[PDB]
Design a protein around this ligand. Structure first.
Ligand SMILES: S=c1[nH]c2c(Br)c(Br)c(Br)c(Br)c2[nH]1
Length: 325
């Protein structure tokens, strides 16, 4: 399987661009950036609100937990490649603790509001607007040969007051190369596409469009996560109990995928649950025919059948957003 778009990006570009292992990091000054307050944490880093002592300007200090040299260069190269494109987190500097060599990445500051607190207050229009902003990040990075591979609310920073969106955490991101077999141990469980769950290694940008779709489905339906699986096999069961088993069946045969008998048994047999079955009084005001139609073209088993980030941005759903530009 190849990408239906931007397949030749890293092919027509110099080896400098995509060859991240040849990166030689030009380290900055660790004294320039003081920690003010903790603002988050994850498996691979701790994150702090910071200050630049030169200019008194706020920043984000992302202190990294012991990481392989290979993986950290991947994150940096991608960050440097994408630095400047639409709604991408801007990497300001790269520094290290002299004694222990622990790297820190310094980012632009964003006054983010947690999605568990923010999202319930988003109106019909705000949702349209912020997904559109995310779509700009996605098409940009896709256009540059990068798949984010970890699209979720936690990686989407939002200052509601100033209406600014930044796509963050490019720790799982990767250069797309035509027919290169990739590790399916990427994204976070509730946003893993069916390609990763069934061991289809030759995936592409399309992966991020599934992830995007789970995120979107949770926002309009007010049910986050939308696909709540307990583990990788249960994650697929949850998808199958929505999109239906037949669509799964045709998808698997098209790519010559054989499922594990353990998994195939677990999945079982299920009919399709129409999207309108997720409507209620808590969410009636965010669900529309346009929302449903957009959601519908994103959440497809077949990665080749999903809307591309560019196609998605032109959807009548986002029309009023486009007119305001
Ligand atoms: S974790 C984590 N949290 C976080 C925040 Br709150 C911001 Br504003 C920013 Br800009 C970044 Br890069 C991260 N990572």
């Amino acid at each position: 399987s190849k990408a239906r778009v931007y397949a030749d990006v890293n092919v027509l570009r110099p080896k400098e661009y995509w060859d991240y292992e040849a990166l030689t990091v030009q380290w900055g000054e660790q004294d320039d950036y003081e920690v003010v307050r903790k603002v988050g944490r994850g498996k691979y880093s701790e994150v702090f609100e910071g200050i630049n002592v030169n200019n008194n300007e706020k920043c984000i200090i992302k202190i990294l937990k012991p990481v392989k040299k290979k993986k950290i260069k991947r994150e940096i190269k991608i960050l440097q490649n994408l630095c400047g494109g639409p709604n991408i987190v801007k990497l300001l500097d790269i520094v290290r603790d002299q004694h222990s060599k622990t790297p820190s990445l310094i980012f632009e500051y964003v006054n983010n509001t947690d999605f568990k607190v923010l999202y319930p207050t988003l109106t019909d229009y705000d949702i349209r607007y912020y997904i559109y902003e995310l779509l700009k990040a996605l098409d940009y990075c896709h256009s540059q040969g990068i798949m984010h591979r970890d699209v979720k609310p936690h990686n989407v920073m939002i200052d509601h007051e100033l209406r600014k969106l930044r796509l963050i955490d490019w720790g799982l991101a990767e250069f797309y190369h035509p027919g290169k077999e990739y590790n399916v141990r990427v994204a976070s469980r509730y946003f893993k596409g069916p390609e990763l769950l069934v061991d289809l290694q030759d995936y592409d940008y399309s992966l991020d469009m599934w992830s995007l779709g789970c995120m979107f489905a949770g926002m309009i339906f007010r049910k986050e996560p939308f696909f709540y699986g307990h583990d990788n096999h249960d994650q697929l069961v949850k998808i199958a109990k929505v999109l239906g088993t037949d669509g799964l069946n045709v998808y698997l045969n098209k790519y010559r995928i054989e499922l594990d008998p353990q998994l195939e048994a677990l999945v079982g047999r299920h009919s399709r649950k129409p999207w309108l079955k997720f409507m209620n009084a808590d969410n009636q005001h965010l669900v529309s025919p346009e929302a449903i139609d957009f959601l519908d073209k994103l959440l497809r088993y077949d990665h080749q059948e999903r809307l591309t980030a560019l196609e998605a941005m032109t959807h009548p759903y986002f029309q009023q957003v486009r007119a305001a530009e």
